[PDB]
Design a protein around this ligand. Structure first.
Ligand SMILES: [Zn+2]
Ligand SMILES: [Zn+2]
Ligand SMILES: [Zn+2]
Lengths: 107, 45, 271, 547, 84, 99, 143, 107, 171
């Protein structure tokens, strides 16, 4: 997790997938002054083991594609370092029942 | 006429004859080819 | 844009691709038709006046149920084992009370299925209850029964856990309203309900509830499609009778990258 | 009756007709350019229109599989064009396509070797695949016949002829590019087809294609599919009067532009005066499918008329798709002038006698209602409690207003009778713009006199109607289940509570509202004499006078 | 495929749409001169008779409720409580 | 003539879930028509001589696998048009793409 | 194109699906063995239907010229007789389904012969198949 | 998004119930980003072809549909209307079958 | 060569025949529409195993009418010729242009241009034959041929084939 102040070189970063299995992320400075999760509208998220995942899918009979998505370069997706294939459980307030449980997979 | 419909339709109609004041109106009518034109300007006074 | 959206036999809202847009229509699975504006008592007022209403202490001359309500008020008076179950309840309600203020606005009026306010006004004269002769309920009758009730307010039915969690979850708010009107203090001091009455109300709530649930098939998208546009179809570009009204809504639905009047509201810091 | 099994579509597969197939399927060579006249003799020459295809006038012709007009679909024919033409609507992709494939050879411009491509090449999605690809292959323009392998740039084959690939741009209906040493301007001929044909089968698959249902190449037409009469019908002023479709012109025009073309490719061919006539064929074929394009030339039919292009006939509202398919005019329907009645139950709807005597309902004969039916049948179609058509099992219809056996007839269980709507019959009533769930509701029929739909007052605001001239459409159900469906889901009582605002949508309007206020005031007193005539007026009265 | 009589999840009540079509079919069945199993107590409209046949839960029919994935759930008209 | 049942009128009915009734409008009370598709090349080729049973459908040469369907004549034309534009609308009575 | 290069239609891959939704190995059905499966069903059919082949046809046959022929031919060419003699072969043989059947329903003496009428093997099965090949003609029941 | 549409409705005194706006809002958000209710949005997803074909680019919508050879389920409301079959819409969102087993208990 | 594929078929039934013992009728009706059929797709349908206990499952009721739609899922014994495939049958007829063979319910023909040169048709010989420097083929005789091509037709599949290589022909 390198924290580039302004920007890394195009010649540079072309050596990130050159050290697999491991993976590296890049975050601009001026974009991390305030944690976005702490925000009112931003609900608390949570990851899900490939057991709890292979359960969720089974418990509702869902085919992955049938699941609400989230962009890979999404501020929260990055923040929690998601990956193409990972799920995220969202728990927010609901003026009809109190609490709803939504999930978004990271494509 | 010809393969030239690139004219303007509306001009010349079938004069109303429902009532006298109808017919009258029709002759004294003006058109205006196409949110601002539709407005009722002052100049219309 | 919503045509192919329709509730499914498990209560999921999806489309012509099966993509789940909502796991439980409206986040509760209730059909708007069967819903009315109720007022969740619990939420408003001070903890002091709250306590002076729902707090019960069988070990005290002034904060106990007057013997004009039960038929065994004195032979029940002082039981330590019961006053603990009376805490469990009250300890719950406080978890609730603080969890509901966790709607920071305070507005206690909300749309909620099963009009408990009326259903009791109905009980009032079906069995004709006098504001004179004491009721006849064990403290267990009521509390356990309302616990047994919550258990039957089933939306989802699943065997496993994941479902049963969703169950409790997308219900909760309701349950609190239920308790709010089924607290020991009120059910006995205000409307002396008999054993019969209680057994009726429950049975009806249960039945009513199950009917207030959405019916699978309901072409929801087409429904919501109109439901939204209609009170928009009835307006004037005139903002009579910042960029607002008709064009703004348009602007939004178009997901415009450059609205005329942008603006942004920021609140100060704590202090 | 047809022995073949009845089924429903569970899947629709799109692709493109392969010329060899279109040829195959075609049952008419369609070579001649005339109309019919077998040399002035009136018929239909085996050349153009009807050379065995369908027919009109209850005339068996239809590739002899008779059936005549109704039962008989149109019948396709073809026409071998002399030379390949560009498909008016594909010119966009075709160009971005060439930017990605090499000419003079015909193979990819990026193999598994390059990484960023692999990813894209693995993206399983016929559209998002073809997206990422072009953004890459649009730069490199040299079909290297020798290139440094994935080792040492010392040693160096794949496809050959490293000819520089041109940068194409759109100028009217023609694609041109330059080849570079030093560029080359040339007007790219329709070479392209050949290159596609050559493209490897395994390459097709690399892009979002399928060697079986749609290969890139089939985007250019060789043998043109000629559509039959039912597609481009003639409208005669009875019979012995012309009446020809828009398309029934631009076909012979195409034909002629084909003929003349060929008659320039077998005679003194002025090589730079031919292109001027190919572009012409190219044009008439542009016309035929679309005649509202960029390079103006509207191509108007003698009079100024625009000439509906197939895609015009489809343009939303009125045009086929949204006009005839997504919503069509239907039978068993009626419309007239509305006027409210304060003495009709909420869910009723007073219907004008005239109308009741027109709309029917197929009700099967049963030993429970035979008695009632036997009265209704004798009355005839001009008497109110009557009927107007009797249909025996043997799919044929007796017209109840003429037939010599009018009062005779004894029914037979299992037959169906179409009766006039009667009191307490569910029917679909509506008012457009239909923007509500409540804009259509089932009402009970109540036959009344006078030419107008009599609806209740309180149900005015849902449709949002008034009586200042407004008209209303009425539709009439047809099945035994349909009815149930009308009363179990569209009944007025179920609609009383609007789901959008969890509140009703029908209250007490005008007079009734205005007055109930007065009538309510403490100052409002009523004496016995009136207090009697009022309880009587209440149908639901418990029959007990309150103290 | 399948799905045992056990682990059945859908509603035990008959959705108006289910009910609506059931009354539908059986109605035309009767109008196809089929046999009715009750006492038309002066009743004469098939759909009423069926509505009665319903209120008395005596309509031999089974509803296979399908789930988005492709599996199904069978329930009888006898089973499904018909309060309303 | 006859009154149009345009989009907005469709919509409403769909909200009501009046599936069948709608299917009964667009077909029984208007268009309707019995077309014969081919079990192989999903097209409207079949030479159905309703007498000598003869069905056929050359170019794909079949006479055995053919299906019957009930669709609005208005639509049949839409397809012929689409065909006449060189696009191929295959109709399958069985799913083939799987998943 | 369709050829005996073992590139049969898409409808007959070694892994087909059971009516109950399961996976099952193809079904090779050599002569004689076929004559039994048929006869067995045709018998237990004509059993509850009452609760030597020309007759049995115009009763359990469509009334189906095809069966008489399919019964004669399958009895004038069957290369075996006992449900055991066929079992042995299966208890043995279990190569791709088509072969294990063809080898059983087609006469063969030499390997040179089999390898000639089935030119696709050669390296698609070790030589000691030859042993077996003898072992076949070796258990090629006597007359 | 919800808050914003609501504030356009509530400034006119009119009230609409959450679930509705929610549903819309969700469909726009769910597909990964912000699909606008316009030719450059919903009408451009992996949805059915006949469906999207019934709005704006009607013909062109088909060209690039037969081009990449799309396969349409016919599970979408539109398709069936165009075909004339009962769509899986309430009344038809299920089957009615005679159970022979009980059809013996039925005599 | 014979297989046992688990196929299925759909049959519609008018409401009249909607009694209590239907499964029985369905089963027996299946056979009358299957046993004896022939499709180029699946070949020659000859026998349905385990009749008695066929599985029918619930059938659905068509909305329009009252009829029921049944998806009968069975299993059967079939036999279909493939190209390059090798089998042997009895010669049925025999002229100067070749001979016709009968494989079960089938009839395959061998062209005089697809046989080995050295086998000419014998003229006035009883029974009518074809002569080789040593061999002789006639009706009775069993011949092993190779099916070059197969043509699927109505309710019968005919074909063509040859005996020109070596180790092929009569036996
Ligand atoms: Zn015909
Ligand atoms: Zn090249
Ligand atoms: Zn075909």
């Amino acid at each position: 997790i390198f924290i580039y102040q302004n920007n890394i070189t195009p010649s540079a970063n072309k050596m990130i997938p050159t050290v697999s299995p491991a993976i590296i992320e890049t975050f601009q400075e001026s974009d991390l002054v305030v944690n976005i999760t702490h925000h009112e509208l931003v609900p608390k998220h949570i990851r899900l083991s490939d057991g709890e995942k292979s359960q969720l899918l089974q418990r509702y009979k869902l085919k992955e594609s049938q699941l609400p998505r989230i962009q890979r370069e999404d501020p929260v997706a990055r923040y929690l370092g998601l990956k193409r294939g990972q799920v995220v459980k969202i728990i927010r307030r609901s003026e009809t029942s109190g609490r709803y449980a939504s999930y978004r997979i990271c494509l | 006429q010809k393969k030239a419909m690139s004219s303007r339709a509306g001009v010349s109609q079938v004069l109303n004859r429902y009532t006298y004041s109808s017919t009258l109106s029709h002759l004294r009518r003006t058109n205006t080819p196409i949110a601002k034109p539709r407005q009722l300007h002052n100049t219309h006074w | 844009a919503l045509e192919d959206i329709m509730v499914h036999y498990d209560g999921t809202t999806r489309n012509s691709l099966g993509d789940i847009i909502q796991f439980l229509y409206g986040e509760d699975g209730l059909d708007g038709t069967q819903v009315e504006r109720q007022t969740i008592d619990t939420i408003p007022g001070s903890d002091k006046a709250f306590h002076k209403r729902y707090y019960v202490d069988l070990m005290d001359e002034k904060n106990s149920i007057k013997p004009d309500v039960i038929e065994y008020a004195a032979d029940i008076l002082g039981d330590v084992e019961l006053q603990k179950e009376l805490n469990s309840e009250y300890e719950q309600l406080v978890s609730d009370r603080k969890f509901l203020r966790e709607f920071v606005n305070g507005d206690h009026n909300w749309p909620l299925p099963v009009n408990l306010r009326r259903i009791i006004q109905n009980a009032q004269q079906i069995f004709h209850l006098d504001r004179a002769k004491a009721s006849d309920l064990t403290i267990p009758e009521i509390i356990h029964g309302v616990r047994d009730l919550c258990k039957k307010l089933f939306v989802l039915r699943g065997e496993n856990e994941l479902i049963k969690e969703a169950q409790q979850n997308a219900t909760s708010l309701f349950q609190c309203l239920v308790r709010a009107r089924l607290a020991t203090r009120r059910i006995l001091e205000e409307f002396r309900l008999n054993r019969d009455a209680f057994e009726w109300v429950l049975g009806t709530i249960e039945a009513q509830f199950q009917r207030s649930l959405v019916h699978p098939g309901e072409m929801v998208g087409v429904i919501a499609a109109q439901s939204i546009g209609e009170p928009a179809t009835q307006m004037t570009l005139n903002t009579f009778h910042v960029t607002l009204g008709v064009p703004r809504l348009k602007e939004i639905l178009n997901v415009a990258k450059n609205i005329k009047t942008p603006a942004l509201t920021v609140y100060l810091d704590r202090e | 009756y047809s022995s073949a099994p009845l089924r429903s579509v569970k899947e629709v597969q799109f692709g493109l007709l392969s010329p060899e197939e279109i040829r195959a399927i075609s049952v008419v060579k369609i070579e001649y350019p005339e109309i019919m006249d077998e040399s002035r003799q009136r018929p239909r020459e085996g050349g153009l229109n009807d050379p065995k295809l369908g027919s009109i006038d209850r005339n068996f012709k239809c590739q002899t599989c008779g059936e005549g007009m109704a039962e008989c679909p149109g019948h396709f024919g073809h026409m071998e064009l002399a030379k390949p033409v560009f498909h008016i609507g594909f010119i966009p992709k075709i160009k971005k396509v060439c930017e990605c494939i090499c000419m003079n050879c015909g193979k990819l411009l990026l193999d598994e070797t390059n990484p960023t491509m692999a990813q894209a090449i693995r993206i399983r999605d016929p559209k998002k695949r073809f997206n990422a690809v072009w953004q890459l292959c649009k730069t490199k323009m040299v079909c290297e016949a020798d290139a440094p392998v994935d080792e040492y740039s010392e040693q160096k084959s794949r496809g050959g002829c490293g000819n520089t690939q041109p940068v194409v741009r759109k100028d009217g209906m023609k694609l041109w590019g330059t080849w570079k040493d030093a560029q080359p301007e040339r007007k790219l001929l329709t070479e392209i087809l050949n290159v596609f044909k050559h493209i490897s089968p395994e390459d097709c698959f690399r892009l979002g294609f399928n060697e079986d249902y749609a290969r890139p190449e089939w985007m250019i037409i060789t043998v043109l599919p000629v559509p039959p009469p039912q597609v481009r019908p003639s409208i005669a002023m009875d019979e012995t009067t012309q009446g020809q479709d828009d398309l029934t012109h631009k076909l012979s025009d195409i034909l002629k532009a084909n003929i003349n073309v060929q008659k320039l490719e077998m005679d003194g061919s002025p090589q730079h005066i031919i292109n001027e006539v190919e572009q012409l064929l190219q044009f008439h074929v542009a016309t035929y499918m679309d005649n509202d394009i960029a390079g103006q030339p509207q191509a108007l039919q003698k009079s100024g008329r625009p000439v509906k292009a197939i895609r015009a006939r489809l343009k939303g509202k009125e045009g086929r798709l949204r006009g005839n398919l997504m919503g069509k005019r239907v039978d068993f329907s009626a419309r007239t002038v509305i006027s409210g009645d304060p003495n009709l139950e909420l869910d009723q709807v007073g219907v004008p006698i005239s109308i009741a005597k027109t709309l029917s309902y197929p009700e099967t004969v049963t030993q429970y209602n035979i008695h009632r039916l036997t009265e209704y049948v004798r009355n005839g179609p001009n008497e109110h409690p009557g009927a107007k058509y009797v249909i025996r099992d043997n799919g044929d219809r007796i017209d109840l207003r003429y037939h010599k056996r009018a009062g005779d007839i004894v029914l037979q269980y299992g037959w169906k009778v179409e009766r006039h709507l009667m009191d307490d019959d569910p029917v679909l009533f509506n008012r457009q713009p239909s923007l509500h769930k409540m804009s259509m509701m089932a009402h009970r029929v109540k036959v009344m006199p006078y030419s107008t739909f009599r609806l209740n007052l309180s149900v005015t605001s849902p449709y949002n109607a008034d009586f200042d001239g407004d008209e209303m459409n009425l539709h009439v159900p047809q099945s035994e289940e349909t009815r149930a469906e009308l009363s179990q889901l569209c009944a007025v009582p179920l609609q009383i509570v609007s789901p959008q605002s969890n509140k009703p949508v029908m209250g007490i309007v005008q007079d009734t509202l205005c007055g109930v206020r007065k009538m309510t005031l403490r100052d409002t007193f009523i004496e016995y004499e009136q207090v009697m005539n009022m309880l009587f007026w209440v149908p639901s009265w418990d029959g007990v006078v309150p103290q | 495929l399948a799905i045992l009589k056990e682990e059945r999840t859908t509603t035990p009540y008959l959705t108006k749409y289910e009910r609506a079509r059931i009354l539908g079919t059986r109605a035309l069945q009767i109008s196809m001169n089929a046999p009715v199993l009750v006492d038309i107590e002066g009743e004469t409209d098939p759909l009423q008779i069926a509505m009665k046949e319903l209120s008395q839960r005596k309509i031999p029919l089974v509803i296979r409720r399908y789930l988005p994935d492709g599996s199904y759930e069978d329930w009888g008209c006898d089973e499904l409580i018909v309060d309303n | 003539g006859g009154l149009r049942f345009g989009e907005m009128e469709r919509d409403c009915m769909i909200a009501h879930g009046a599936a069948g009734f709608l299917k009964e409008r667009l077909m029984e009370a208007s268009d309707a028509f019995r077309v014969h598709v081919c079990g192989i090349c999903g097209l409207m080729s079949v030479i159905a001589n309703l007498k000598k049973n003869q069905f056929e459908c050359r170019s794909c040469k079949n006479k055995t696998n053919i299906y019957q369907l009930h669709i609005p004549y208005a639509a049949k034309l839409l397809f012929q048009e689409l065909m006449a534009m060189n696009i191929a609308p295959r109709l399958y009575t069985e799913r083939s793409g799987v998943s | 194109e369709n050829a005996t290069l073992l590139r049969l239609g898409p409808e007959f891959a070694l892994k087909q699906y059971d009516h109950d939704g399961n996976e099952h190995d193809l079904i090779a059905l050599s002569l004689s063995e076929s004559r039994l499966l048929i006869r067995e069903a045709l018998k237990a059919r004509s059993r509850a239907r009452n609760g030597d082949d020309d007759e049995l046809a115009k009763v359990t046959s469509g009334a189906n010229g095809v069966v008489k022929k399919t019964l004669d031919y399958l009895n004038t060419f069957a290369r075996f007789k006992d449900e055991e003699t066929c079992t042995a072969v299966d208890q043995l043989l279990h190569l791709h389904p088509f072969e294990i059947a063809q080898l059983s329903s087609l006469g063969c003496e030499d390997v040179d012969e089999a390898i000639t009428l089935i030119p696709s093997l050669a390296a698609k099965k070790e030589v000691n198949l030859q042993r077996i090949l003898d072992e076949l003609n070796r258990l090629e029941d006597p007359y | 998004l919800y808050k914003e549409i609501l504030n356009v409705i509530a400034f006119d005194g009119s009230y609409v119930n959450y679930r509705h706006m929610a549903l819309l809002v969700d469909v726009m958000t769910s597909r990964g980003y912000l699909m606008a209710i316009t030719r450059h949005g919903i009408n451009r997803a992996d949805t059915g072809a006949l469906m999207r074909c019934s709005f704006e680019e009607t013909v062109e919508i088909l060209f690039e549909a037969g081009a990449a050879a799309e396969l349409d389920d016919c599970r979408g409301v539109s398709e069936n209307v165009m075909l004339g079959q009962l769509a899986p819409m309430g009344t038809g969102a299920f089957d009615v079958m005679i159970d022979e087993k009980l059809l013996t208990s039925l005599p | 060569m014979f297989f046992l594929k688990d196929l299925s078929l759909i049959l519609t039934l008018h409401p009249s025949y909607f009694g209590p013992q239907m499964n029985q009728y369905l089963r027996e009706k299946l056979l009358t529409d299957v046993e004896g059929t022939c499709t180029g797709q699946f070949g020659y349908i000859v026998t349905v195993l385990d009749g008695m206990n066929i599985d029918v499952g619930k059938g659905r009721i068509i909305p329009g009418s009252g009829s029921a739609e049944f998806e009968v899922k069975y299993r059967a014994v079939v036999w279909k010729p493939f190209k390059g495939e090798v089998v042997d049958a009895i010669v049925s007829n025999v002229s100067p242009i070749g001979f016709f063979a009968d494989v079960g319910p089938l009839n395959v023909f061998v062209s005089t241009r697809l046989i080995p040169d050295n086998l000419v048709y014998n003229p006035s010989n009883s029974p009518p034959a074809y002569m080789s420097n040593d061999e002789l083929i006639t009706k009775g005789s069993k011949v092993r041929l190779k099916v070059v091509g197969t043509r699927t037709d109505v309710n019968e599949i005919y074909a063509i084939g040859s005996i020109k290589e070596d180790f092929l022909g009569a036996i």
